[PDB]
Nucleic acid binder design. Sequence first.
RNA 1: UUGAUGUCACGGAACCUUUGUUGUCUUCGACAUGGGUA
Length: 49
Amino acid sequence: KAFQEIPENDPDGWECKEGYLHVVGPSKVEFSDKKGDVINNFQGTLPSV
RNA sequence: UUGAUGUCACGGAACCUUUGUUGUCUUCGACAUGGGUA
């Protein structure tokens, strides 16, 4: 894992190293015409895009 | 820019010869997506 800010529950064992961020976006997306089983188990209402 | 007693230049068809031709079924099913977990 990598965190710029130290997590509250794990404040020990973190090493600061230089590097770059490979930023692309929410690319892992599955789209379907019909409601999937995972979507059918969603609690509440589906937010807009 | 002529020369003189002598100019058929209306004396001479830019004329003659070469195929835009050749080759192609308006046809049709498997994915797309990048991690996540530890």
